[PDB]
Amino acid sequence: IEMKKGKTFLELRDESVPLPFQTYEQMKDYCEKFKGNPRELASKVSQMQSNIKLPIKHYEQNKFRQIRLPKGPMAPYTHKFLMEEAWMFTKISDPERSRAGEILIDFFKKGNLSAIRPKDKPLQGKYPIHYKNLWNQIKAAIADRTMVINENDHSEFLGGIGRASKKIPEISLTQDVITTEGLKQSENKLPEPRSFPRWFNAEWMWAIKDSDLTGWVPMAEYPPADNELEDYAEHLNKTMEGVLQGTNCAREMGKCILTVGALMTECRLFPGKIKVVPIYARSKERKSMQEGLPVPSEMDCLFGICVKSKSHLNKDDGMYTIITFEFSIREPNLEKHQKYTVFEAGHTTVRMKKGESVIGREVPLYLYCRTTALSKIKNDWLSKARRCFITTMDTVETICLRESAKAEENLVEKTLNEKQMWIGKKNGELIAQPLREALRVQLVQQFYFCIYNDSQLEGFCNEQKKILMALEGDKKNKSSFGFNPEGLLEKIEECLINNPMCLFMAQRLNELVIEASKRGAKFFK
Amino acid sequence: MEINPYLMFLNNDVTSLISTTYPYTGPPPMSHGSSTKYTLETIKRTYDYSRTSVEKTSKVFNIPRRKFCNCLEDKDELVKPTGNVDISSLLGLAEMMEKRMGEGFFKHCVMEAETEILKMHFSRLTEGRQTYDWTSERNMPAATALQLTVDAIKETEGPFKGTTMLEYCNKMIEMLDWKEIKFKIDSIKHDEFLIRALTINTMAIATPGMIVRPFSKIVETVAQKICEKLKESGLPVGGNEKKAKLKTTVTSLNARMNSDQFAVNITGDNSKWNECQQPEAYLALLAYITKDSSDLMKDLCSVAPVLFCNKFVKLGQGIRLSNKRKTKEVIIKAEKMGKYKNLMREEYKNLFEPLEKYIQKDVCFLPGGMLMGMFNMLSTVLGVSTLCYMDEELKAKGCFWTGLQSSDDFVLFAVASNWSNIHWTIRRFNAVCKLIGINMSLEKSYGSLPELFEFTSMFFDGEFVSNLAMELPAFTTAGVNEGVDFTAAMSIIKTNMINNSLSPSTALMALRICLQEFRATYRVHPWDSRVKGGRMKIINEFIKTIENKDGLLIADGGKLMNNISTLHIPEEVLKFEKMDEQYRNRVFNPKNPFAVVSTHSFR
Amino acid sequence: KFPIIANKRMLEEAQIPKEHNNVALWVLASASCINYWNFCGPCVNNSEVIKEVYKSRFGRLERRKEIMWKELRFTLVDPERMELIHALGGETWIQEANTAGISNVDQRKNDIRAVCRKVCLAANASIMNAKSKLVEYIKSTSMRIGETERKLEELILETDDVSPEVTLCKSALGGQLGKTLSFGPMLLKKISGSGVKVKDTVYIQGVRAVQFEYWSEQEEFYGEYKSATALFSRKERSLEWITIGGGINEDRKRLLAMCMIFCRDGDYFKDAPATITMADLSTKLGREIPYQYVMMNWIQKSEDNLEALLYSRGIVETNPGKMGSSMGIDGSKRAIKSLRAVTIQSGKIDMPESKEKIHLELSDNLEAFDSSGRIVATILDLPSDKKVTFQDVSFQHPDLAVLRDEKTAITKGYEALIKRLGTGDNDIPSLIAKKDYLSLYNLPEVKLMAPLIRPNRKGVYSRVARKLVSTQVTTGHYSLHELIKVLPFTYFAPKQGMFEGRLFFSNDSFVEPGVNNNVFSWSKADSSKIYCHGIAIRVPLVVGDEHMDTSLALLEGFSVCENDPRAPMVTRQDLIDVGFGQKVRLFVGQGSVRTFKRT
């Protein structure tokens, strides 16, 4: 028995071999009889150690430096929807009409949408007429009880503005044709570099706040229990869900979930067609106007509408396009709102408590228009937003066992209610809150990671780890040593082009090392 | 006020909060498109890391063959990655490792791998991530291309009745010499079939065909049988065993040296671990290994190496043209880019002319390197050989080293009695590593005192070993059945808990999330819910006919009953005695038109 | 649409019609077909075959069912189980679940020490009757210790387990000691030397001053902490030398800090931190505290305090040949730089034994004294009061336990409401049949439960409850369950306001009609039971129809009616502007909708 040999294989084997050997047999004999001469090997490695000129540092005599950010205009808003400047109409939830096609029609019946009549001239925008005619067509379609749009003039345009052209076969090509058309390779456009955003902090603060309504995110049930572990597991989960569900970030999470759940189905059952889809969310309880306690209130909310272009999700890496019509009661700013075309759509009403009754105060109303693309992978990534709860729950639990083990007793409630965590600086002084209140910051961080996910963020997060470990070593009086820090600084500065988060987690990393210098000796000023 | 999320690292550790730095696991939305630009840059950097200029025209293709092994030149600027290997030092390190472990070590391992292969069925090759068809010229699972190959063999020269790996390999060999080959209909000649078999496609993770697959599997089996006996080999498994290895190493170290020495750790990250591994050195190493064994294995292990010494690389989608206003856009393939080089930009031109020699029709005859994520075990073995080095020059100075190495990530532990000899030892180690192509990065490799380091996302510290390899399932991409995907997820979560990457509350949250993902996937909901979906319609009427709602299945308006202590137990086994006998027998009816064998399968 | 494949004869032989209810189901087929097959299809009896084939899985299930779950505990490191190690023990936690072995001694030790701690704490409520109240608590506390119903006057003596609480409680019994000490959670012991007490001062904020005491002579001791041994010598308010043989970071750090306080070494015994000035309270609610225990408490707050204390101890650069026996700021075994007068090593320091028993004397603050002062124990070295459920226990003397909580208060109120029924005149059914509801608004039990009510908006709750009660009584349609649920609110006067759908107590809890809740729940087919936090209570009567009529227990001026989807959904507020003959849907709970009509 043996592997019967061919010919071409043997020729290759005898060909592909090291330099001094030209046949498999010579190399084989040299190998099977190789003997050890550690002296020549030591001389060779010493010679290499001579020609090599490795640089080794200690971070003390040659410290790090602050990062040099790009320069230019501010980084604009990037997410698809609106978080802080949003607005929503409300209505009662019917389990018999719990679908987008029905919820949208119901919202339209009372005629609050038909009252939305944006004027011709906008405040800041590019293609206002297309958006306006498209909004009229959307209202017409909803009136017809069909979400479809027959005419394809505006959607087609706004979907083709990115790229649309003819194509000539290579076989029909000559030199005179080329010289006539001036054909040349298609110069790739490299993304431009932006400055530090001055609105991230406001959005973060707003997200940390508590929403009037609650129950934005749906969850499964809780199985039975058979011992103290599962009970204690149930206890932590309930409290943590107690705190995070009431936050404005949960609202955006539920909105993304319920909107993507409809878009992923529309791109499946009506491909190559133009459909209409709402931007809605569902709540289950609020807080009394007379009492700060929860109250059952099942309700639906509509933030805006999203139109769909032709989407097959089997070509062009499954790229498709949409168009957003969101509502707002806050005039825009020119910097943050650059990709948005804005209008003024009449007025609306706001409702607030007045003693033991409710009143209504009329306010203006704005309409935010924007175009953007998506894909199948982005849908699968957004639909799975809940996993953010998994990570925040996990960071809460690492802090409630480590301590519980140092003292060898249950300290869960004690640490949650007492353990203070630095959150920020106000008036040149630190601010601290309990863990029960920093869960919000952790969750918002994870969410923003889930939104602005991109290669830039991957590199940033993969690189900052080294700085963090160096800092930790500094704290505990350990002579951390490296080889080329400036190269790492460059690796990190090259992946800061235009991802709002990456630019604003860099400015914030700079500021962690300017405060620690007061107790560390490995960083410049 | 200003919210700076990072100020919690001051009065706390890092092993507890580092997880907050990286996003959650899942399929990334980055989706980088392997296209002509990146592949050509890769090939260029490959030919460049070869510090030689020698060549030898072949006789099977009439093409040069850059032989970058044992011909080192251009010593200048050796800091950057190198690929020229020295066989003498390689075999010397192999001999050191053999002496350490034992004499009949390689022999025992190769014998075990052989005997294991003998009783193996070629059908095993169907278990693979993906491959590249040599007939349709596309990428597909292993089973599809395997069926294609066998039916082509049938159509051309009769069926393959071996039903074993060895007959499959010999059939491939014989086919290498066939002049004409058919397939559903069209045929091809010898040279074209050879090329196709030696073709590779970028998925730029490689995606080889099926001819070389079994030999690669054999070599990997051998390398695995070897890596098990090695203490410093964290590749085959991770977690509990990995921590055991870590602590064993650390304790042996602490008990080894004396009071006068002071240790140091280093977090290293090999750069270009795929563009500096050469199959020629692997071939010589395998030869030295099997030197004393059945010639069968001697010849077998020498197959995949040469198959990788000659590997045509499929260039991605060709470039596109356009006029000024972009109203017209032409599309051309790769094979014709040499026909319009006068138009492409310089950066794209200077990256194309020097390689035109190696192009044949649309591919590039890469004579070496190792792009696939293959031979990882073998590379790890080579690294362990690097770490098992020791001589008298060190002993005289009272210094040495040790550590652990993954595929392309490692951790070093140096020992000395002075704050300078450590530098000498580090430089010695880097030199011996570069002698055989194994390089190291400088902007991503750091070091500090022994207490702190990192390895495969497991950030070790004086205590509080923290993991970050939290995996999860995915139903939409891999939909199988409504009675397996939940049990598999439960087992996965159990595993993750074993590796300490998950905690009780975290596991429960992940479970309640995966349940909802499952339901939304198969479009199912409970009965309490006021849903109006198709599958619910019938369930909204045939539900009152039962009382054991607890026993109901999740796929049929059921509710959860499993928990942490009941994961290994499928919900079925947990509801059997509880399901109303009617529904029970209605499910377990083998007389139906269609792990636990349910009446819930989607063939 | 029909991706799932199937067989053909298998389909007709089962008589599976397509579009049964507009669902095609299908060779190919849909997924709903499986639903239709498992809900209406052939019936087999193959359970035994399935079990036999899957014996391994079902034996694993059986084994799992054969477990006696035990407690869990947070701690660190100083086949049939491999199937469950994932859920048995991690690294920070572990569960002591057992299979067949039973031995109840160490759990008994934990229980007895916990209760001793408890009682010794309970005696810390006066200033003069400490020993008296203590001993009387002891004599009034019995236990079903293990399996024997023993008293807590002999276990403290029969047991041999050194501890601050055991000693602190046994000294009052003139019991034998073992010459052991307790400075906080740490355990100390003397080896050689001796001295006398001496006083000195220490400033706070840089202006004030406070007196503490110490020893001036040389004396060696044997410290000991969790997984950490040590040896050291104290001399003149300062630590001369010290050695350690237990290798752990946190344990060594805390043990060293405690031994330093025991030696009062450091400058913070000259001045004080700026954190102490925040309080300057070396005092309890009405008692005094030394400086050492205040410093300790300041340590327990954060490890930064520990690091500051250790920095107060001189840090220097280690010389060669000493790395193996050096130390670091974070407990690192060896380091280029270490702390002054330190020595690390491996192997736990063998602890000596003293075979000389003695008896101490308690003080006003219960501090025990053997001789030459040398306090051996006190309450100051105890943890804060930690509520823990005690079982197998009897505690009779007052101060035994508060046993008073809002939950228990509500439970007792509802028990009284239920018993009041009493199947007799001048009780719930007689007033019902008589249609005298006003008297219900004056009963004693509602007056006892009134304090548990939210005061700010009790008028509206009473109004609504008095509406429901009258509307259910007059008509004769009612349900004792919902009545008793809402009665405690029918005491105060009615007022105008906005109601939401929930009745809130003062403990932030609530109750809601027409639904069930942990505090109060019930269901038909078991109407003779009423759950209260899972505690099933009984009804002194029997009913089969008095409860079946809940058409008026949901809303105030409405009545349930037949379901009708056409009716529009509404809220609880717009109800005021409805008319008659106008049906309306409305949520009565979570995803629970019902139709209502006025009157």
PDB file of all heavy atoms in Angstrom, chain A residues 482-503:
ATOM      1  N   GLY A 482       8.013  50.300  25.817  1.00  0.00           N
ATOM      2  CA  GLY A 482       7.525  50.115  24.465  1.00  0.00           C
ATOM      3  C   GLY A 482       8.625  50.191  23.428  1.00  0.00           C
ATOM      4  O   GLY A 482       9.810  50.122  23.769  1.00  0.00           O
ATOM      5  N   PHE A 483       8.248  50.334  22.164  1.00  0.00           N
ATOM      6  CA  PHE A 483       9.213  50.361  21.069  1.00  0.00           C
ATOM      7  C   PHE A 483       9.048  51.559  20.146  1.00  0.00           C
ATOM      8  O   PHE A 483      10.050  52.093  19.664  1.00  0.00           O
ATOM      9  CB  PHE A 483       9.098  49.065  20.262  1.00  0.00           C
ATOM     10  CG  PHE A 483       9.137  47.824  21.105  1.00  0.00           C
ATOM     11  CD1 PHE A 483       7.972  47.269  21.594  1.00  0.00           C
ATOM     12  CD2 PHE A 483      10.340  47.217  21.413  1.00  0.00           C
ATOM     13  CE1 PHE A 483       8.003  46.130  22.372  1.00  0.00           C
ATOM     14  CE2 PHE A 483      10.378  46.077  22.189  1.00  0.00           C
ATOM     15  CZ  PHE A 483       9.208  45.534  22.670  1.00  0.00           C
ATOM     16  N   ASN A 484       7.818  51.995  19.886  1.00  0.00           N
ATOM     17  CA  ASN A 484       7.597  53.135  19.004  1.00  0.00           C
ATOM     18  C   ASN A 484       6.228  53.752  19.258  1.00  0.00           C
ATOM     19  O   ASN A 484       5.282  53.509  18.496  1.00  0.00           O
ATOM     20  CB  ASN A 484       7.731  52.715  17.540  1.00  0.00           C
ATOM     21  CG  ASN A 484       7.562  53.876  16.583  1.00  0.00           C
ATOM     22  OD1 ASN A 484       7.668  55.039  16.976  1.00  0.00           O
ATOM     23  ND2 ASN A 484       7.303  53.569  15.319  1.00  0.00           N
ATOM     24  N   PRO A 485       6.080  54.553  20.315  1.00  0.00           N
ATOM     25  CA  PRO A 485       4.760  55.137  20.607  1.00  0.00           C
ATOM     26  C   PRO A 485       4.232  56.033  19.501  1.00  0.00           C
ATOM     27  O   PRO A 485       3.043  55.953  19.161  1.00  0.00           O
ATOM     28  CB  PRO A 485       5.009  55.922  21.903  1.00  0.00           C
ATOM     29  CG  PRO A 485       6.235  55.316  22.496  1.00  0.00           C
ATOM     30  CD  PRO A 485       7.076  54.897  21.340  1.00  0.00           C
ATOM     31  N   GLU A 486       5.078  56.897  18.938  1.00  0.00           N
ATOM     32  CA  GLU A 486       4.605  57.828  17.919  1.00  0.00           C
ATOM     33  C   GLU A 486       3.958  57.086  16.757  1.00  0.00           C
ATOM     34  O   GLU A 486       2.989  57.572  16.160  1.00  0.00           O
ATOM     35  CB  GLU A 486       5.760  58.693  17.423  1.00  0.00           C
ATOM     36  CG  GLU A 486       5.319  59.923  16.646  1.00  0.00           C
ATOM     37  CD  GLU A 486       4.641  60.955  17.523  1.00  0.00           C
ATOM     38  OE1 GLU A 486       4.857  60.924  18.753  1.00  0.00           O
ATOM     39  OE2 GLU A 486       3.894  61.797  16.985  1.00  0.00           O
ATOM     40  N   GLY A 487       4.480  55.908  16.416  1.00  0.00           N
ATOM     41  CA  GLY A 487       3.847  55.112  15.382  1.00  0.00           C
ATOM     42  C   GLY A 487       2.425  54.733  15.745  1.00  0.00           C
ATOM     43  O   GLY A 487       1.531  54.743  14.897  1.00  0.00           O
ATOM     44  N   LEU A 488       2.197  54.400  17.017  1.00  0.00           N
ATOM     45  CA  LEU A 488       0.845  54.100  17.470  1.00  0.00           C
ATOM     46  C   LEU A 488      -0.041  55.339  17.414  1.00  0.00           C
ATOM     47  O   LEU A 488      -1.207  55.265  17.002  1.00  0.00           O
ATOM     48  CB  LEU A 488       0.894  53.532  18.885  1.00  0.00           C
ATOM     49  CG  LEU A 488      -0.434  53.370  19.619  1.00  0.00           C
ATOM     50  CD1 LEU A 488      -1.403  52.558  18.789  1.00  0.00           C
ATOM     51  CD2 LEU A 488      -0.201  52.711  20.961  1.00  0.00           C
ATOM     52  N   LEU A 489       0.493  56.485  17.838  1.00  0.00           N
ATOM     53  CA  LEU A 489      -0.263  57.729  17.725  1.00  0.00           C
ATOM     54  C   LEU A 489      -0.686  57.976  16.286  1.00  0.00           C
ATOM     55  O   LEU A 489      -1.807  58.424  16.028  1.00  0.00           O
ATOM     56  CB  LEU A 489       0.566  58.900  18.245  1.00  0.00           C
ATOM     57  CG  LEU A 489       1.138  58.749  19.652  1.00  0.00           C
ATOM     58  CD1 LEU A 489       1.849  60.022  20.058  1.00  0.00           C
ATOM     59  CD2 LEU A 489       0.045  58.405  20.643  1.00  0.00           C
ATOM     60  N   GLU A 490       0.200  57.691  15.333  1.00  0.00           N
ATOM     61  CA  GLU A 490      -0.147  57.869  13.927  1.00  0.00           C
ATOM     62  C   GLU A 490      -1.199  56.861  13.486  1.00  0.00           C
ATOM     63  O   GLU A 490      -2.140  57.209  12.760  1.00  0.00           O
ATOM     64  CB  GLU A 490       1.103  57.754  13.061  1.00  0.00           C
ATOM     65  CG  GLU A 490       2.129  58.840  13.322  1.00  0.00           C
ATOM     66  CD  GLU A 490       3.424  58.610  12.570  1.00  0.00           C
ATOM     67  OE1 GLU A 490       3.548  57.564  11.902  1.00  0.00           O
ATOM     68  OE2 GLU A 490       4.317  59.481  12.649  1.00  0.00           O
ATOM     69  N   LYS A 491      -1.033  55.596  13.878  1.00  0.00           N
ATOM     70  CA  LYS A 491      -2.042  54.586  13.580  1.00  0.00           C
ATOM     71  C   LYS A 491      -3.411  55.015  14.076  1.00  0.00           C
ATOM     72  O   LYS A 491      -4.431  54.675  13.464  1.00  0.00           O
ATOM     73  CB  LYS A 491      -1.656  53.250  14.214  1.00  0.00           C
ATOM     74  CG  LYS A 491      -0.441  52.598  13.589  1.00  0.00           C
ATOM     75  CD  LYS A 491      -0.758  52.069  12.203  1.00  0.00           C
ATOM     76  CE  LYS A 491       0.392  51.253  11.638  1.00  0.00           C
ATOM     77  NZ  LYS A 491       0.658  50.032  12.443  1.00  0.00           N
ATOM     78  N   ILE A 492      -3.457  55.754  15.179  1.00  0.00           N
ATOM     79  CA  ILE A 492      -4.738  56.177  15.729  1.00  0.00           C
ATOM     80  C   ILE A 492      -5.239  57.455  15.064  1.00  0.00           C
ATOM     81  O   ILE A 492      -6.450  57.632  14.907  1.00  0.00           O
ATOM     82  CB  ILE A 492      -4.636  56.356  17.251  1.00  0.00           C
ATOM     83  CG1 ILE A 492      -4.346  55.013  17.918  1.00  0.00           C
ATOM     84  CG2 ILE A 492      -5.910  56.966  17.789  1.00  0.00           C
ATOM     85  CD1 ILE A 492      -3.948  55.122  19.370  1.00  0.00           C
ATOM     86  N   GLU A 493      -4.337  58.349  14.669  1.00  0.00           N
ATOM     87  CA  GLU A 493      -4.755  59.585  14.023  1.00  0.00           C
ATOM     88  C   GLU A 493      -5.201  59.355  12.590  1.00  0.00           C
ATOM     89  O   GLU A 493      -5.968  60.163  12.055  1.00  0.00           O
ATOM     90  CB  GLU A 493      -3.617  60.604  14.045  1.00  0.00           C
ATOM     91  CG  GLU A 493      -3.313  61.171  15.418  1.00  0.00           C
ATOM     92  CD  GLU A 493      -2.094  62.074  15.423  1.00  0.00           C
ATOM     93  OE1 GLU A 493      -1.299  62.005  14.464  1.00  0.00           O
ATOM     94  OE2 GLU A 493      -1.934  62.852  16.386  1.00  0.00           O
ATOM     95  N   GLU A 494      -4.740  58.278  11.953  1.00  0.00           N
ATOM     96  CA  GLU A 494      -5.115  58.033  10.567  1.00  0.00           C
ATOM     97  C   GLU A 494      -6.552  57.550  10.432  1.00  0.00           C
ATOM     98  O   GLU A 494      -7.125  57.648   9.341  1.00  0.00           O
ATOM     99  CB  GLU A 494      -4.172  57.012   9.933  1.00  0.00           C
ATOM    100  CG  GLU A 494      -4.104  55.690  10.668  1.00  0.00           C
ATOM    101  CD  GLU A 494      -3.286  54.656   9.926  1.00  0.00           C
ATOM    102  OE1 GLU A 494      -2.810  54.960   8.811  1.00  0.00           O
ATOM    103  OE2 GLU A 494      -3.121  53.536  10.454  1.00  0.00           O
ATOM    104  N   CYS A 495      -7.115  56.959  11.491  1.00  0.00           N
ATOM    105  CA  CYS A 495      -8.496  56.419  11.474  1.00  0.00           C
ATOM    106  C   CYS A 495      -9.422  57.372  12.220  1.00  0.00           C
ATOM    107  O   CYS A 495     -10.142  56.871  13.078  1.00  0.00           O
ATOM    108  CB  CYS A 495      -8.515  55.011  12.041  1.00  0.00           C
ATOM    109  SG  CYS A 495      -8.842  54.946  13.817  1.00  0.00           S
ATOM    110  N   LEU A 496      -9.336  58.667  11.959  1.00  0.00           N
ATOM    111  CA  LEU A 496     -10.200  59.701  12.538  1.00  0.00           C
ATOM    112  C   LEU A 496     -10.471  60.583  11.339  1.00  0.00           C
ATOM    113  O   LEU A 496      -9.614  61.425  11.118  1.00  0.00           O
ATOM    114  CB  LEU A 496      -9.430  60.464  13.612  1.00  0.00           C
ATOM    115  CG  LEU A 496      -9.688  60.088  15.067  1.00  0.00           C
ATOM    116  CD1 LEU A 496      -9.334  58.647  15.351  1.00  0.00           C
ATOM    117  CD2 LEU A 496      -8.908  61.004  15.988  1.00  0.00           C
ATOM    118  N   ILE A 497     -11.465  60.266  10.508  1.00  0.00           N
ATOM    119  CA  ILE A 497     -11.781  61.011   9.259  1.00  0.00           C
ATOM    120  C   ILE A 497     -13.145  61.649   9.433  1.00  0.00           C
ATOM    121  O   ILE A 497     -13.138  62.838   9.546  1.00  0.00           O
ATOM    122  CB  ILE A 497     -11.672  60.102   8.027  1.00  0.00           C
ATOM    123  CG1 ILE A 497     -10.677  58.957   8.229  1.00  0.00           C
ATOM    124  CG2 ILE A 497     -11.334  60.935   6.806  1.00  0.00           C
ATOM    125  CD1 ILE A 497     -10.570  58.027   7.051  1.00  0.00           C
ATOM    126  N   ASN A 498     -14.263  60.926   9.449  1.00  0.00           N
ATOM    127  CA  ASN A 498     -15.583  61.527   9.733  1.00  0.00           C
ATOM    128  C   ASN A 498     -16.528  60.500  10.307  1.00  0.00           C
ATOM    129  O   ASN A 498     -17.418  60.135   9.555  1.00  0.00           O
ATOM    130  CB  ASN A 498     -16.222  62.130   8.496  1.00  0.00           C
ATOM    131  CG  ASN A 498     -16.177  61.201   7.305  1.00  0.00           C
ATOM    132  OD1 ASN A 498     -15.864  60.024   7.446  1.00  0.00           O
ATOM    133  ND2 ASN A 498     -16.485  61.724   6.133  1.00  0.00           N
ATOM    134  N   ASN A 499     -16.308  59.992  11.510  1.00  0.00           N
ATOM    135  CA  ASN A 499     -17.273  59.142  12.240  1.00  0.00           C
ATOM    136  C   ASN A 499     -17.518  59.958  13.474  1.00  0.00           C
ATOM    137  O   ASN A 499     -16.558  60.206  14.153  1.00  0.00           O
ATOM    138  CB  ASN A 499     -16.745  57.785  12.657  1.00  0.00           C
ATOM    139  CG  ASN A 499     -17.827  56.755  12.855  1.00  0.00           C
ATOM    140  OD1 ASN A 499     -18.910  56.869  12.295  1.00  0.00           O
ATOM    141  ND2 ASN A 499     -17.514  55.713  13.602  1.00  0.00           N
ATOM    142  N   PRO A 500     -18.675  60.600  13.722  1.00  0.00           N
ATOM    143  CA  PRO A 500     -18.831  61.386  14.875  1.00  0.00           C
ATOM    144  C   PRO A 500     -18.239  60.758  16.118  1.00  0.00           C
ATOM    145  O   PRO A 500     -17.515  61.415  16.730  1.00  0.00           O
ATOM    146  CB  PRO A 500     -20.318  61.548  14.942  1.00  0.00           C
ATOM    147  CG  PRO A 500     -20.637  61.877  13.554  1.00  0.00           C
ATOM    148  CD  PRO A 500     -19.798  60.850  12.834  1.00  0.00           C
ATOM    149  N   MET A 501     -18.495  59.518  16.435  1.00  0.00           N
ATOM    150  CA  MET A 501     -18.009  58.995  17.721  1.00  0.00           C
ATOM    151  C   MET A 501     -16.494  58.990  17.769  1.00  0.00           C
ATOM    152  O   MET A 501     -15.964  59.536  18.716  1.00  0.00           O
ATOM    153  CB  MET A 501     -18.483  57.572  17.947  1.00  0.00           C
ATOM    154  CG  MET A 501     -17.941  56.937  19.175  1.00  0.00           C
ATOM    155  SD  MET A 501     -19.289  56.437  20.210  1.00  0.00           S
ATOM    156  CE  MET A 501     -19.191  57.631  21.538  1.00  0.00           C
ATOM    157  N   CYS A 502     -15.799  58.531  16.746  1.00  0.00           N
ATOM    158  CA  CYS A 502     -14.343  58.340  16.800  1.00  0.00           C
ATOM    159  C   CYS A 502     -13.703  59.653  17.107  1.00  0.00           C
ATOM    160  O   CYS A 502     -12.797  59.625  17.854  1.00  0.00           O
ATOM    161  CB  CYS A 502     -13.771  57.937  15.474  1.00  0.00           C
ATOM    162  SG  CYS A 502     -13.139  56.258  15.430  1.00  0.00           S
ATOM    163  N   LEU A 503     -14.163  60.743  16.510  1.00  0.00           N
ATOM    164  CA  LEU A 503     -13.604  62.081  16.765  1.00  0.00           C
ATOM    165  C   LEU A 503     -13.861  62.439  18.236  1.00  0.00           C
ATOM    166  O   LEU A 503     -12.937  62.946  18.808  1.00  0.00           O
ATOM    167  CB  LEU A 503     -14.168  63.079  15.750  1.00  0.00           C
ATOM    168  CG  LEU A 503     -13.632  62.964  14.333  1.00  0.00           C
ATOM    169  CD1 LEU A 503     -14.301  63.979  13.438  1.00  0.00           C
ATOM    170  CD2 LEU A 503     -12.135  63.159  14.309  1.00  0.00           C
TER     171      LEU A 503
END
